[PDB]
Design a protein around this ligand. Sequence first.
Ligand SMILES: Cc1cc2nc3c(=O)[nH]c(=O)nc-3n(C[C@H](O)[C@H](O)[C@H](O)COP(=O)(O)OP(=O)(O)OC[C@H]3O[C@@H](n4cnc5c(N)ncnc54)[C@H](O)[C@@H]3O)c2cc1C
Ligand SMILES: Cc1cc2nc3c(=O)[nH]c(=O)nc-3n(C[C@H](O)[C@H](O)[C@H](O)COP(=O)(O)OP(=O)(O)OC[C@H]3O[C@@H](n4cnc5c(N)ncnc54)[C@H](O)[C@@H]3O)c2cc1C
Ligand SMILES: NC(=O)C1=CN([C@@H]2O[C@H](COP(=O)(O)OP(=O)(O)OC[C@H]3O[C@@H](n4cnc5c(N)ncnc54)[C@H](OP(=O)(O)O)[C@@H]3O)[C@@H](O)[C@H]2O)C=CC1
Ligand SMILES: NC(=O)C1=CN([C@@H]2O[C@H](COP(=O)(O)OP(=O)(O)OC[C@H]3O[C@@H](n4cnc5c(N)ncnc54)[C@H](OP(=O)(O)O)[C@@H]3O)[C@@H](O)[C@H]2O)C=CC1
Ligand SMILES: *SC[C@H](NC(=O)CC[C@@H](N)C(=O)O)C(=O)NCC(=O)O
Ligand SMILES: *SC[C@H](NC(=O)CC[C@@H](N)C(=O)O)C(=O)NCC(=O)O
Ligand SMILES: N[C@@H](CCC(=O)N[C@@H](CS)C(=O)NCC(=O)O)C(=O)O
Ligand SMILES: N[C@@H](CCC(=O)N[C@@H](CS)C(=O)NCC(=O)O)C(=O)O
Ligand SMILES: [Ca+2]
Ligand SMILES: [Ca+2]
Lengths: 587, 587
Amino acid sequence: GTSQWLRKTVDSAAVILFSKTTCPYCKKVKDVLAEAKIKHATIELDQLSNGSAIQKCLASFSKIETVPQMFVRGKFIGDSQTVLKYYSNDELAGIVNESKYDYDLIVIGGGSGGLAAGKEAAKYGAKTAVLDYVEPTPIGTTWGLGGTCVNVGCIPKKLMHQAGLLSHALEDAEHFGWSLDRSKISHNWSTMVEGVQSHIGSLNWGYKVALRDNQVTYLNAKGRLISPHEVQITDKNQKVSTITGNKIILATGERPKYPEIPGAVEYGITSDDLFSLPYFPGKTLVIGASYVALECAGFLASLGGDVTVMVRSILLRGFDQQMAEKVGDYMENHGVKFAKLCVPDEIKQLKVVDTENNKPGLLLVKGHYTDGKKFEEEFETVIFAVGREPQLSKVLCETVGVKLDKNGRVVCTDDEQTTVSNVYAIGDINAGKPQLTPVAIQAGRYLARRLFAGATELTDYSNVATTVFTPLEYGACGLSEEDAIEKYGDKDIEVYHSNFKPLEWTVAHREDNVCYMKLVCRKSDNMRVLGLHVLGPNAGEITQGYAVAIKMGATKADFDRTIGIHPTCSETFTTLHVTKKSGVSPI
Amino acid sequence: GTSQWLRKTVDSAAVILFSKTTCPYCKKVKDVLAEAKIKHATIELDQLSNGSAIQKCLASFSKIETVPQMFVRGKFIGDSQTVLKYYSNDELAGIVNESKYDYDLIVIGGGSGGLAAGKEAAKYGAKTAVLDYVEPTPIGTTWGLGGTCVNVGCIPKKLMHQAGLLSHALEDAEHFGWSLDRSKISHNWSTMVEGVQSHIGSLNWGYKVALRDNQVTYLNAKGRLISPHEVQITDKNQKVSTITGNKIILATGERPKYPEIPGAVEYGITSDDLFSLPYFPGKTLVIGASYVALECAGFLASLGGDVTVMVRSILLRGFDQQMAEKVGDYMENHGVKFAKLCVPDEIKQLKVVDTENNKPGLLLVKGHYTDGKKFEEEFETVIFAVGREPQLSKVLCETVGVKLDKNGRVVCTDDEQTTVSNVYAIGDINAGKPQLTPVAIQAGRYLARRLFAGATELTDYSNVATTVFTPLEYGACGLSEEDAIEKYGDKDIEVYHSNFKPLEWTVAHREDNVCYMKLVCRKSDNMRVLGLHVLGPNAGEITQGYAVAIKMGATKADFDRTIGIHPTCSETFTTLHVTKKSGVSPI
Ligand SMILES: Cc1cc2nc3c(=O)[nH]c(=O)nc-3n(C[C@H](O)[C@H](O)[C@H](O)COP(=O)(O)OP(=O)(O)OC[C@H]3O[C@@H](n4cnc5c(N)ncnc54)[C@H](O)[C@@H]3O)c2cc1C
Ligand SMILES: Cc1cc2nc3c(=O)[nH]c(=O)nc-3n(C[C@H](O)[C@H](O)[C@H](O)COP(=O)(O)OP(=O)(O)OC[C@H]3O[C@@H](n4cnc5c(N)ncnc54)[C@H](O)[C@@H]3O)c2cc1C
Ligand SMILES: NC(=O)C1=CN([C@@H]2O[C@H](COP(=O)(O)OP(=O)(O)OC[C@H]3O[C@@H](n4cnc5c(N)ncnc54)[C@H](OP(=O)(O)O)[C@@H]3O)[C@@H](O)[C@H]2O)C=CC1
Ligand SMILES: NC(=O)C1=CN([C@@H]2O[C@H](COP(=O)(O)OP(=O)(O)OC[C@H]3O[C@@H](n4cnc5c(N)ncnc54)[C@H](OP(=O)(O)O)[C@@H]3O)[C@@H](O)[C@H]2O)C=CC1
Ligand SMILES: *SC[C@H](NC(=O)CC[C@@H](N)C(=O)O)C(=O)NCC(=O)O
Ligand SMILES: *SC[C@H](NC(=O)CC[C@@H](N)C(=O)O)C(=O)NCC(=O)O
Ligand SMILES: N[C@@H](CCC(=O)N[C@@H](CS)C(=O)NCC(=O)O)C(=O)O
Ligand SMILES: N[C@@H](CCC(=O)N[C@@H](CS)C(=O)NCC(=O)O)C(=O)O
Ligand SMILES: [Ca+2]
Ligand SMILES: [Ca+2]
């Protein structure tokens, strides 16, 4: 496959140097490229097991088999003497700038995936543009560069989770001997929001600076792909123009859904609004039951809010349902109210948001339970967390020839390629992929490296660990218990499980037999670990290291031979014994 | 090796049943043994790849090759009919009780290792005794069952660490929008100590109950081995008697050292005293610089104490010294004072501890720096943390024939065997082994399983992860950078490193470029991970999962293909790039 590899690399790379580490002629070219501040990929052939065969294949493109060999956009440009000739004649800059298109890469969307792809491509000398535009929410919320995670997702969510966790740190402090008067302590929502937004601000600015420093062109503009190589852009001044690019990356992400009921769009809010909400939500209804719903309900409650979650059917559809029940039971036991098997029919306004005193309005929510009981209750704030959807066009998109699925997501190969061959999709819009920030980031970086640096490594989307940052956190890697049973049959599945109590919870007088972990294992495959699950503090820190071991194909015996660190919650994974089949209590 | 395995198992096991899972005669024996509450090991031959050869070998001991086959203390006892015959004649109890010795196992020491070994042996029907006695410290401190960790180590240390961490949670709360008056918050040492000691109390009681429930005989008594099978015991009433045992496990642990200076023993304290100290230490000097010193100095400071650490030479000798410098620099930047290259010459009393008002005394510490400067300063409490030593006898011990090393530790094989063949040593007294609780626990359990359940698995003492619970925590697994360079040469070592900032530290306005991690890797061995190091919050939770991957032989590429969980500190391990050799800043 070394012939096809070289062909793909030469044809895709913007600026690439085939080299050897002990070659003084290769060094002379590197010195020239650095002095002229020409960024490029470098492949050192003496570092590759097939490097000699690569040298032979290079003659298909250059007629030579020596190093160095410099290419620009599919075209052999010269050996060392030739490159030096361009340098001394001041032709080199013109040569490396020469292109059929305005850009080697246009990235549409400047979130986790887009920024990662864009910055990484610039590193190998690709002329790169990143387009980002934030369509306002129905109530007008907008924000800066960085995408969902930075502005309206992981970052503000985890920070509000921390604010929530600190509530309980205050309770725990007393049992640890701290003398404070908790009846006189209160939380100020807007102060927290100011601190959160101040940090987000530094991230917005940070990414802009990063794009500058990597010589990526940033356009605060809405992009539309109108042909394989043509992107139509609309600026703030509403000016329309067209830019051309060799490769296009679609990284446009998703936006929250609203249910199709009266008053939803007019009076409700979503996560998009919540994280910069200038008033405190007050008595809140969250509609929905997956991780956005539960994470938001959870930090709101810990801040002292009166919180209700309206659950159509189950919690965290798609997650292990025993773990999901445990996540919910903990939240229920700690003040979060659940309206079970209940759907909303309408929102009616009773009071407008006080914009001067930064206070919430008041809403009437009518709904109904499965049994026929009507739901009718007042809330200061209604939050919809009922899924997220991509914002591209079944028709328009197909007219440029990019195929979307039923749900409006882009159908891609295992190297992120769409049905238009120079066009790729990464992050949340890529059909079938886990919708997480580091996945989008890994995909973008790996994709940029393949396109412009001749890398071969595909993103591995299997066994990607997650954490739901509910009040008690839930970390998982691999399969749910039910999905593993479905795949391999009950008789081939062994589950090791245990309750545990963090040492910190002992003096603090918190629950026995609530924190919980399990390993789902396949008997036939040497007790291969198929799924890991932990409900407990710092679950994400706990889970992460185990995701490496699982990707390497960890078995139970691997876990068993490993010695614990004491005292930690994580060490419980190293001494698990009780199986579910034995019926013995995990307590 | 299946002949030797069976010989060792039959000869060592107290009560063992060789069986098959589909045999109704084996089930009949199991029913009998359960009805008569006879605990035993069970080996299911149809579950072992060499089970058929085992069946053939069993005839060397029983003259039969069928299942079931029951053994007691080296002696074939019967097939199923025979066992049922003993049952119906009411002979079975007598048979299984028959022994040359009072016990199959005597465990001397009831700490982490001893309790683990003892409880695990009882599970397979071994008649087990555990001896524990706590020699009082010079000032009279004593405590209950469970050993160093439970009473004067990991447990109270981590709980005081948590109390310390909560101090900073209080500072962080305000930036997260919590309204509290910190100028009016103070810490009460004795309240904290009460909560800590109350939990320890429940552990003492818990272990006693566990020994009861597992039918282990517990003797609060000092044991001395006087011959291979004879243990002399001294009770509280000072009564001396002798008990005999087949196997002996030495699990007697260590005690803090004092330097040989005037006033040390009379006026100073150690970790043994600190965790139940009924007065607050006040202005404190810690003498020493390894993890006990730094962990204690650290939580004392976070509680608002005026703390000084007197450092003979370096911090954390034996740990990676770049990481050790970083641990210290953080503590120095946060109020802990270091008297560098300084040794104590004498302690003099200025004030006696106030025993009625639970207040500390006052001490004068004289010492000298390497340059000739005298050290002279007043402290309310002086803490020695200058190492720990075993408490067994170079002569007495050798007279029973158990060999000790230069440092007084027991010299053992890789299966914990001493130079006396029925005598084993586990935990801190085992020469050359990492001195950690879960190591002692794993060793005890694995040892009990080998002796009484026919297991083969040795404890793996390589790449055991640790965490130093300093104010900023330090987790490590595998080799220091300097030890890896020493082993494989500089040219074969690549180090990937990065600073990071916990997301929580952003709103809280804490340090950039202080949290830090690295992977020490071997170039020749496919960038094999030889050492992992992380300085940051929750370092132990971070480190633990990676210890499984490292035991499996993780390479850098394994880390690279693994996707991060966002947002966590741990995910930084999944995207490391910067190498030390490149000179690029980790910032
Ligand atoms: C509340 C919440 C909490 C979350 N928490 C976590 C978490 O803890 N951990 C985790 O891993 N993931 C979390 N996620 C998911 C994570 O945020 C996403 O998976 C990730 O941000 C998606 O990255 P992206 O690059 O695909 O899209 P985005 O980050 O959404 O970027 C797309 C960008 O392109 C813009 N755009 C759209 N159309 C155009 C156009 N045509 N022209 C120009 N620009 C356009 C969009 O406005 C946006 O700025 C969370 C998500 C939410 C909603
Ligand atoms: C301050 C401190 C903090 C620590 N923190 C951690 C940590 O965070 N994580 C970790 O893994 N490790 C930690 N350790 C180490 C851990 O405590 C030890 O490694 C472990 O307890 C040793 O177990 P052991 O069974 O060998 O000995 P021990 O637990 O010391 O048990 C020995 C017992 O036997 C008794 N004994 C002695 N002689 C006799 C006799 N002849 N007859 C009868 N009984 C006798 C002793 O009094 C004691 O009760 C810490 C240690 C200290 C001192
Ligand atoms: N890594 C992380 O910590 C986080 C990641 N995310 C990302 O965000 C994405 C989507 O977030 P989220 O908003 O939680 O959506 P999800 O796709 O995860 O789930 C939608 C939820 O809303 C409910 N729902 C859907 N329609 C209705 C309806 N019309 N009426 C009432 N309830 C309804 C569903 O319940 P039902 O089962 O009945 O259909 C389900 O509980 C996820 O896919 C994930 O990738 C979000 C939060 C945290
Ligand atoms: N896992 C964990 O979190 C923890 C485990 N432990 C266990 O406890 C054991 C011992 O604890 P520790 O007390 O820290 O002892 P250590 O053996 O770890 O180190 C002794 C320390 O005291 C110093 N020292 C020794 N003698 C003198 C002297 N006479 N004058 C001044 N300073 C001196 C040494 O400095 P120098 O370099 O100059 O010799 C060194 O810093 C460890 O081996 C470990 O297994 C302890 C705490 C935490
Ligand atoms: S996928 C084809 C293309 N879509 C986009 O470039 C993004 C559209 C999305 N931002 C939106 O609709 O908001 C497209 O719509 N083609 C336009 C055309 O004229 O062919
Ligand atoms: S190791 C030989 C034996 N030691 C012990 O059983 C423990 C001694 C220790 N607890 C202590 O000294 O405090 C021993 O000392 N032999 C005595 C003898 O008379 O041979
Ligand atoms: N004319 C060439 C010189 C090529 C040359 O002498 N390079 C040597 C390496 S220093 C080479 O490619 N031959 C050895 C090999 O097979 O790699 C240039 O200017 O680049
Ligand atoms: N007399 C024996 C009966 C032994 C017997 O019939 N056992 C069968 C299993 S059910 C056996 O060991 N033979 C089959 C084999 O080779 O495992 C007893 O009472 O234990
Ligand atoms: Ca283990
Ligand atoms: Ca990665």
